[PDB]
DNA sequence: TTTTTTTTTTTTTTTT
């Protein structure tokens, strides 16, 4: 609250898992920590699932920790083909000839799935508790929560109690609310902390909020800005940096 | 359990990867979004009179003659006979439902009828989820068109979640048409205003539980209102969005041709 | 089941295809939109006091004498006696209600009953003396009288957003199930910047009160404009805003009022 | 049912066009040449700026319609109480300004001329006043039309009945009040004058400094110009008394525009016709 | 309910012999075309931000309280109670009290503080208010229970803190409080920003449509008085008074000129000729 | 809640038994008479013309030289940055502009001699970066017992009219009946035509951007002008725009800016 | 005992 001037005697004289791409994130929020609930809030088609899938790939090969996915947005094979194409630096699911040309398919399969690292998913709290106890998962990702006031808040309190009981890194993605006046978030508007559907617990029981903004109907729709909106451990919020998508490969890279 | 490890999944991916349907007119659509694919939900949104039903009816003609795929219509906006007379006139290069003399001059009616309806391609429609499940199971329909959803907040959201679950369970191409919202300040969409993704009635889940959004713009009270512009707003597969191309209507014939 | 195969539809199309009602005055209308057709919903718009009821009254007059079709008026805005007197004055070429030296002159000459059965001698016109009750009354007009044209004077006083949406869907379902020609008249909304509509401002398709459902479930929209406090408030403009069946829109023509008589007649005006 | 056929409506029309009609205005000639008076079952609305004479002209009209024409006039004035709007009519009848002079008030207290001026004006039951929820107001107006049998009813300052009522959205309340009031006026067939205000202009001159007022300047909603039969606006510039009349919408006739010029007399309070 | 106009003979006479205009001070030009203030009379007083609203209002409250016997109730919300009380005492003693620490230190020692206090507050003609629905209730308790004649409010924008509906409901409640009670009600409001031109604080003549908050404020007010002064010009203490609206008399325009005295705080009637 | 004039016999006598002087220039105190309990002071200039430097200098003068508890709420930067700014301003150096100067003071042990001379007397308090701010300022006023509270860069806290009007109303209600001097730093609106604020435009009172309620609840308004592009970039001008207490507006004096210690001195420039 | 869309009307400000 109120900080006295006597507690600045030495401070004037004055981590966890790291994020891949846009290096002003782990410079700013000091990476992810155990027991946290990270929210990734952006508009439609802004690259939420792509960013969290890149994070999941960089936390399953360079980190080696057991990663449990909850992709209720698409099937379990397409999200694996996206991982294989991302890892192999080549846009896989959107090129027609290469998908039958490479079938060395076992060579590209086993190089990234030789371990028992990744655990995909086709009640949900019991499934995540099983993924946490019987499998040793350290990163749990949930992509779509809007299908899973009072029932939203009870679900969020139950997820927060599960996270406090376990100590697992948890990344949950939800959507934005429809702007009522002016332009939209998809065309150059910064995301506020108010812009959240469902209820108001998304900015209360979470620990950090990451937003991505790009002008989709513009001259360069592949040049995002990343914004931190909340961070209980640091307080450093605002602009992180800029990334490009690199449409040949699909890796989000800062520049 | 419902857990699936990444190790025991080499078969299910191999049988999965072992473009899809194309769009006719303004060929910078399948140059941009690479045409339609399976299991999708496609939204076609424009203003009143902009040419939504004309575009989807031309697409339904072009997917039932050269493709031969089973097409299931749901034209809740109009009757079941006018939507067939428009297909007959469009296939026969003649503005049929507007010329009174030719409608009685041709009656060669069966000659124009059998050439396009000799197959079991098209299945029309005069609870709705059970009807669409029947049209998908007992008929083999690969394309399902729904002309109007606003006559069918939570009542739209639960309906869209159930439609997306049905599309996920079946793997059917599904096109759904809804309208634009009311603009508050400035010009209207009917006089040359570009469309943002905000312009959707009902709620905001329409842009979140879909896969692509296609919009048309034409200056109706202008000098040449027969020159549409097509805009792609969203594409989860590619990301390529923006102005695709132009189509002229060719008022004598009725075919949208790219020029 | 409600599925229909396209193969088993050869006969129902043949009995279906086996122009419609023309419009009177400003002959660029029926050249452009080709008149009304059975099973439509028509919108007529203008500013306040610009003559929407005046324009639809001439059409109800010309559709009852030259056509012979059953016409059902729904004058929610006024009484039945006043619109009956205005129809009599509009047919007999004489401004009736707006002249008191003649309203007592024709009742003593005995030719009032001559002018009465000259236009009301048939069973053409059916007036309405004022939601679900209105729908039941229009259904009884359609079934129990065989009406071809049903005119609704004013829709804004029916609502005493979702209640406008449900009403418009129900009216479209009624007019499609019975196939009756249905005309609906509404007003415009207050513009925020610039001039008002009454001094010659052209009307866009946004300017519709209540909600935006008035243009998404209607087949054609006709707007009429006239510079009221101008050089002359007689030369009116007619604009087609939307048409599903024909498509061609824009300015149709130019009419004058003929203040001595009151007939909207087309006149020569290029620009 | 209500499906009245056009054939079985003969004698009704014979008893409609034979009878009412008329009830001319005062102060100007061009007003009656365009609007052709006030008729039973209509709505005539008069607007001005702030403090421009939308009450003086109407009380001057209510003096003429209650004395020289015998019609029972009911004044629902809500700006002032019944003690002042009945006192100003006496002075306007006697061609003076009674409230604006403390000499003549004490003089008519002394000599007894107040009783002569009271019983000369109110010798016949022609003026019915009302003192100040929207429910009981229409009930008292229905009591004026049914029990008292009023022929002219003047409702002044409709802005006070939309602002003293607790409503979230004001536009629907104005619309519902206007359609219920027009339903009352059409069912009863009584002449009903309703007085409302104007709103703030966006830029340019102000309405109290000579701005030519248009029809879209009505304050509160757009239901005020859609359900009225006649709209008359008054415009002057503070020649601080030269007031002109503008017909904005005539539904009966078609002649609208500049009707004429009036001059307000600072001594008597009458709206005399001008020459210009 | 409704009444007939022939049962009013016993009250129209009773209103005819009751109502008396309370004369303004500082300028005779205001009282020439307004004839004062009566029972049931809402007077709006406005000028630019810092041009002398509360000073002229405080002078009017001082002259109607200690010289005319009217019981005056103030509801000053800009300042505290002791600050406006000290300013009333210093204004009545023709000095500038709170702007001088030496005089405030001097008058507490020689015992003339009570000499200045009891000469004003001995008759008990003034009442003060110490800081939406409870405010009108306390004003009703001030009117009925205490028996005050002229109620003065200051800085209406606190009570409204959508603003247009709130200020319209508030103006309707204050008009209903003023009418059918017989109480003078003085209301102070501010001015919105001019779009183009110069500022009101630099000498622009103020029009009628500068009253911020709604358009309903000048519709339910009976008499509107505006002040102006050019503090950046050659003569920064020569104010002008403009009567914008007068429902009773109908004469609007320039009233006169007043000169403000920097040493006594009494703005007096000047003799400037435009 | 209503108190009559008879109960104020000893309260007014309690009120008679002091303005905190403005340092840096004596031309301000000639026409402002300091600042009392409940004296809202608005301080503004152009974009980067030294609002934070002048207000931090006045807080440094009021804190360690006059014995007043000073509470800052700098939202432009965090706690340690403005702490380094206070220490480097008191010790007459330019601390955050040379890395050797930050390194020299810690290698010789004189860094602890600068903390204890400033923050050892408990006369300073800082705040770490909308209704949650007022509840903490209330605990700073009541619990800690401070006298001069400063808030900077109001655009962080704040349709940008209703929010700033409610904020200014709540701050005025907090500063009234408390006995606290609350200084608020704001900005100016952008110039549309003419010269800019970085060139020496003569400022008016209606330049407070966001609303018009910032000059209606402020008690003393001070504006600074610095011509960084002209001949003298180190000369500032102080203009009083509004004084409720006295009423004297215009140029107060002249001060010269320094690029050696960070301070700015009282000058005697001639116009 | 709570979050999101649609819509007509009155005011106070905002940019490149
Ligand atoms: C972020 C981004 C995506 N794209 C393209 C490629 C992506 O596969 C496609 C969409 O990105 P996705 O990350 O797949 O979007 P999403 O699944 O998170 O959306 P939602 O959950 O709201 O339905 O758009 C770009 O072209 N440039 C970009 O910067
Ligand atoms: C698309 C288009 C239509 N038209 C004409 C001919 C069409 O039959 C008519 C309307 O076309 P429709 O395709 O029927 O219009 P719509 O379905 O989008 O509108 P709604 O459902 O809201 O009523 O307009 C053109 O002239 N040029 C064009 O580009
Ligand atoms: C169309 C037209 C009408 N008029 C005048 C003469 C008629 O007596 C008068 C009647 O018009 P109305 O038909 O009553 O106008 P309206 O119904 O559109 O307006 P409202 O919303 O108030 O119902 O219009 C002209 O003068 N010139 C014209 O061209
Ligand atoms: C018309 C007119 C009136 N007057 C005087 C006569 C009256 O005393 C006063 C008009 O009083 P009102 O007519 O009662 O005021 P108003 O109705 O115009 O406005 P509102 O009720 O909304 O406040 O002005 C003139 O001096 N010159 C004029 O030209
Ligand atoms: C009347 C007058 C006062 N003054 C001085 C003494 C006044 O107390 C002071 C103006 O303050 P106020 O008299 O209080 O004026 P105000 O009500 O318009 O301001 P606010 O809303 O902010 O409270 O300035 C002048 O300089 N010139 C003048 O003409
Ligand atoms: Mg996604
Ligand atoms: Mg359609
Ligand atoms: Mg009409
Ligand atoms: Mg009046
Ligand atoms: Mg003041």
CA–CA dist A42, D58 (Å, integer): 61
- Short-list A216, A205, A208, A204, CA closest to A236: A208
Measure the CA–CA gap between C26 and C28, rounded to whole angstroms.
5
Question: Residue with CA nearest G8 C1'?
Answer: D171
A197 half-sphere exposure, CB direction, 13 A CA radius: 20
Residue pair B182/B193 in contact by the 8 Å Cβ criterion: no
Q: Separation of A65 CA from ligand 5 center, angstroms?
A: 72
Q: What is the largest CA-CA distance in chain A?
A: 70
Contact B134 C3 (CB under 8 A): yes
Backbone breaks in chain A after residues (C–N over 2.5 Å): 14, 103, 122, 148
Nearest-Å Rg of the Cα atoms of chain A is 19
**CA-to-CA distance for E200 and E213, rounded, in angstroms?**
17
Give the span between the Cα atoms of C243 and C30, in whole angstroms: 12
Cα dihedral: F8, F9, F14, F17 (round 10):
120
Pairing of strands B143-146, B71-74: parallel
Coil, helix or strand for E187?
Answer: strand
Gap between the Cα atoms of F49 and B226, Å rounded: 58
Q: Is A167 helix (H, G, I), strand (E, B) or coil?
A: coil
Which tokens sit at D42?
A: 């209509």
Supply the DSSP string of C112-162, one letter for each residue: HHHHHHHHHSSS-EEEE---HHHHHHHHHHHHHH--SEEEE--STTT---H
C-alpha distances in Å from residue A234, one per residue of A29, A170, C104, C225: 6, 19, 92, 64
d(CA C148, CA C139): 12
Residues B162, B132: contact at Cβ < 8 Å?
no
Identify which of F98, F82, F91, F97 has the alpha carbon closest to the alpha carbon of residue F114. F91
Residues of B whose CB is below 8 A from C239: 221
Q: Identify which of D4, D215, D225 has the shortest CB distance to residue C80.
A: D4
Residue D46 CA to residue D246 CA, distance in Å, equals 10
The pair of structure tokens assigned to E98 is: 């709170």
Nearest nucleotide (C1') to the CA of residue F165?
A: G12
Assess B12–A contact: CB distance below 8 Å, yes or no. Answer: yes
3-state SS class at E139: helix
- Of A158, C141, A14, E56, residue with least CA distance to F83: A14
Q: How many CB atoms lie within 10 A of CB C121?
A: 10
> C116: which 2 tokens?
């009465």
Nearest to A80 by CA among B5, B170, B236, B18: B5
Strand spans (E) along chain A: 2-4, 37-42, 66-70, 118-121, 137-142, 169-175, 208-213, 223-231, 238-244, 253-254
* Residue appearing with tokens 């056009």: D6
Find residue A68's DSSP bridge partners.
A119, A140
Give the distance, in angstroms, between the CA of residue C261 and the centroid of all CA atoms in the same chain: 20
Distance between CA atoms of residues A30 and A23, nearest Å: 10
CA of E160 to C1' of G8 (A): 24
- Please give the backbone phi and psi of residue B154, each rounded to the nearest 5 degrees, phi first: -70, -35
C-beta separation of D74 from D153 below 8 A: yes
Pocket test for ligand 5, best of E51, E52, E97, E228 (most atoms within 8 A of CB): E52
Nucleotides of G under 7 A from a protein CB: 2-16
Residue C237, C-beta contacts closer than 8 angstroms, at least 6 positions apart = C224, C225, C226, C251, C254
- What six digits make up the tokens of B3? 């857990």
Per-residue CA distances from D44 to D155, D186, D212, D233, D261 (Å):
11, 13, 20, 11, 19
To 5 degrees, how large is the angle CA F11–CA F15–CA F20?
160
Quote the strand ranges of chain B, DSSP E: 3-5, 41-46, 71-74, 122-125, 143-146, 173-179, 212-217, 227-235, 242-248, 257-258
CA of F130 to C1' of G8 (A): 32
* Other C-beta atoms lying within 10 Å of the C-beta of residue B238: 14
C-alpha torsion angle, residues D84, D85, D87, D90 (rounded to 10): 160
F59, containing H or E segment: helix F51-64
Q: Which residue has the tokens 């009616």?
A: B109
* Residues paired with A38 in a beta bridge: A171, A208
Q: What is the DSSP letter of B223?
A: S
Question: Annotated binding site: which residue ranges of B?
Answer: 46-53
> Is residue E271 classed exposed, middle or buried when 0-12, 13-18 and 19+ CB atoms within 10 A define those classes?
exposed
E108 contacts F13? CB cut-off 8 A: yes
* Determination technique for this entry: cryo-EM
DSSP classification of residue F152? -
Beta strands C125-128 and C71-74 are parallel
- Kindly give the pairing relationship between strand F124-127 and strand C265-266: unpaired
Half-sphere exposure of F94 (CA within 13 A, CB side): 9
Long-range pairs, F251-257, Cβ under 8 A, ≥24: F251/F27, F252/F25, F252/F27, F252/F28, F252/F30, F252/F31, F253/F25, F253/F26, F253/F27, F253/F28, F254/F25, F254/F27, F255/F24, F255/F25, F257/F50, F257/F226, F257/F233
Which has the closest alpha carbon to A187: B234, B28, B29, B215?
B234
Sequence-ordered list of residues with C-beta below 8 angstroms from that of F24, at least 6 positions apart, any chain: F54, F57, F58, F61, F255, F264, F266
Distance CA E61, CA E71 (A): 10
Q: What is the DSSP letter of D146?
A: I
Q: Do chains D and C touch (3 or more CB pairs under 8 A)?
A: yes
The Cα C25–Cα D18 span in angstroms is: 32
Write the DSSP string, F208-264: -SS-STTTTS-SEEEEEEE-SSSS-TTEEEEEEEEESSS---EEEEEEEE-SSSS-E
Strand A208-213 relative to strand A223-231, pairing: antiparallel
- Residues C4, B80 contacting (CB under 8 angstroms): yes
Q: A134, A68 in Cβ contact below 8 A?
A: no
Query: How many whole angstroms separate alpha carbon E160 and alpha carbon C110?
Result: 69
CB F126 within 8 A of CB A3: yes
Q: Which two tokens stand for residue C25?
A: 């005055």
Number of structural domains (chain D) is 1
Please give the radius of gyration of chain B, using alpha carbons only, rounded to the nearest integer.
Answer: 20
**What is the spatial distance between Cα B152 and Cα C164, in angstroms, rounded to a whole number?**
16
Distances (CA, A) of D27 to D36, D63, D235, D259, D270: 14, 12, 15, 12, 8
Let me know if chains E and D touch, i.e. at least 3 Cβ pairs under 8 angstroms.
yes
> Is C134 near chain D, with CB under 8 Å?
no
Q: How far is the CA of B196 from the centre of ligand 1 (A)?
A: 17
Rounded Cα distance between A211 and A239, Å, is 10
Backbone phi and psi for residue E248, each to the nearest 5 degrees, phi listed first: -80, -60
Q: Do F216 and E81 touch (CB under 8 A)?
A: no
Are F55 and F186 in contact, with CB atoms under 8 Å apart? Answer: no
Measured between its terminal Cα atoms, the distance across chain E in Å is 54
Q: What CATH number is associated with residue B125?
A: 3.40.50.300
Question: C-alpha angle D29/D35/D41, rounded to 5°?
Answer: 135
Handedness of CA C133, C138, C141, C142 (dihedral sign): negative
Shortest Cα distance from F88 to chain E (angstroms)? 37
Complete DSSP assignment for B69-110:
--EEEE--SS-SSHHHHHHHHHHTTS-TTT-HHHHHH---HH
Q: Whose CA is nearest to atom 21 of ligand 3?
A: C48
Output the CA–CA distances (angstroms, integers) from residue A59 to A55, C191, F22, F219, F264, in the order listed. 6, 57, 59, 58, 55
- Considering only CA atoms, give the Rg of chain D: 20
Q: Which of C25, C98, C99, C27 is nearest to C56 (CA)?
A: C25
Which residue in the block uniquely carries the two structure tokens 């739209």? B156
- How far apart CA C76 and CA C186 sit, in angstroms, is 12
Please give the Cα distance from A183 to A190 (Å, whole number): 10
Cα separation of B227 and F214, whole Å? Answer: 53
Strands B242-248 and B257-258: antiparallel
Only one residue has tokens 């575009």, namely B55
Task: For residue B70, give its domain range.
Answer: 1-259
Q: Flag whether residue E232 sits within 8 Å of chain D, measured between CB atoms.
A: no
3 state DSSP class of E238 = strand
**Residues listed for chain C:** 271
Pairwise CA distance, residues D90 & D121, whole Å: 7
Of residues D16, D61, D18, the one with CA closest to residue D41: D16
Q: Are D111 and D57 in contact (CB under 8 A)?
A: no
Question: D61: which residues sit within 8 A by CB, 6+ positions away?
Answer: D25, D26, D27, D193
At B228, give phi and psi (nearest 5°).
-85, 160
Ligand 2 residue neighbourhood (C-beta within 6 Å)? B 46, 48-54, 77, 218, 226, 228, 249; C 216, 244, 247
Option in D4, D13, D216 nearest C129 (CB): D4
Q: Which of E48, E112, E161, E261 to mutate to test the interface with F (most CBs of F within 10 A)?
A: E161
Q: Which of B120, B182, B225 sits opposite C212 (nearest CB)?
A: B182
Q: Considering only CA atoms, which of B146, D37, F250 is closest in space to residue E230?
A: F250
Any D CB within 8 A of E194 CB = no
In sequence order, the 6+-apart residues with CB closer than 8 A to the CB of A154 are none
CA of A82 to the centre of ligand 6 (A): 13
CA distances (Å), origin E270, targets C9, C151, E45, E219, E238 = 98, 72, 20, 32, 8
**Tokens standing for C105?**
């002159």
Q: Which residues contact E247 (CB under 8 A, 6 or more apart)?
A: D51, E222, E223
Q: DSSP for B129-162?
A: HHHHHHHHHTT--SEEEES--TT--HHHHHHHHH
Q: Which residue has the tokens 């860094």?
A: F111
Contact D170, D162 (CB under 8 A): yes
Are B199 and B45 spatial neighbours (Cβ–Cβ below 8 Å)? Answer: yes
User: Contact B3/A81, CB-based, under 8 Å?
Assistant: no
B185 touches chain C (CB under 8 A): yes
Phi and psi, residue C58, nearest 5°: -65, -35
Question: Is any atom of nucleic acid chain G found less than 7 Å from the CB of residue E211?
Answer: yes
- Å from the C192 CA to the G9 C1': 9
CA-to-CA distance for A76 and A250, rounded, in angstroms? Answer: 19
- Within an 8 Å CB–CB cutoff, is residue E118 touching chain F? no
Tokens 């000659």 correspond to B111
Q: Do E179 and D81 touch (CB under 8 A)?
A: yes
Residues, CB-to-ion distance under 5 Å, ligand 9: D 55, 79
- Catalogue the long-range contacts made by C52-55 (C-beta closer than 8 Å, 24 or more residues apart): C52/C185, C52/C224, C53/C77, C53/C153, C53/C185, C54/C262, C54/C264, C55/C224, C55/C264
* Interatomic CA distance for residues F240 and A168, integer angstroms: 59
CA–CA gap between residue E257 and residue E269 (Å, rounded): 6
C-alpha span between E75 and E66 (Å, rounded):
18
Contact E216, E156 (CB under 8 A): no
Q: Please name the residue whose Cα sits nearest to atom 4 of ligand 1.
A: B239
Structure tokens at B136: 């998908």
Q: How many helices (H) and strands (E) does chain B have?
A: 7, 10
β-strands F124-127, F148-151: how paired? unpaired
Q: Which residues contact D142 (CB under 8 A, 6 or more apart)?
A: D184, D188
Rg (CA), chain F: 20
Cα gap A160→A189, rounded to integer Å: 30
Whether B195 and B162 have beta carbons less than 8 Å apart is answered as no
Beta-carbon contacts of E158 under 8 Å, excluding residues fewer than 6 positions away, are: E77, F169, F173
Neighbours of chain F (3+ CB pairs under 8 A): A, E
């Amino acid at each position: 609250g109120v900080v006295s001037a006597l507690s600045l005697r030495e401070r004037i004289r004055e981590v966890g898992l790291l994020f891949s791409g846009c290096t002003g994130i782990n410079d700013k929020t000091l990476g992810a920590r155990g027991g946290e609930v990270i929210m990734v809030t952006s508009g439609s088609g802004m690259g939420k699932s792509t960013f969290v899938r890149q994070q999941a790939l960089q936390w399953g090969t360079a980190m080696g920790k057991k990663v449990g996915l909850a992709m209720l947005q698409e099937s379990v094979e397409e999200t694996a083909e996206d991982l294989i194409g991302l890892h192999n630096r080549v846009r896989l699911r959107q090129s027609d000839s290469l998908k039958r040309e490479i079938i060395k398919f076992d060579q590209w399969f086993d190089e990234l799935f030789g371990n028992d690292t990744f655990h995909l998913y086709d009640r949900l709290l019991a499934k995540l508790a099983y993924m946490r106890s019987g499998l040793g998962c350290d990163v749990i990702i949930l992509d779509h929560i809007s299908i899973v006031r009072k029932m939203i808040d009870n679900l969020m309190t139950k997820l927060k109690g599960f996270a406090k009981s376990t100590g697992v890194v948890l990344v949950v993605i939800c959507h934005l609310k429809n702007p009522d006046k002016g332009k939209a978030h998809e065309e150059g508007r910064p995301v506020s902390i108010t812009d959240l559907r469902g209820s108001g617990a998304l900015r209360q029981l979470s620990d950090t909020i990451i937003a991505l903004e790009r002008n989709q109907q513009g001259d360069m729709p592949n040049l995002v800005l990343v914004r931190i909106l909340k961070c209980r451990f640091t307080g450093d919020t605002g602009i992180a940096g800029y990334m490009e998508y690199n449409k040949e490969t699909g890796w989000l890279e800062p520049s």
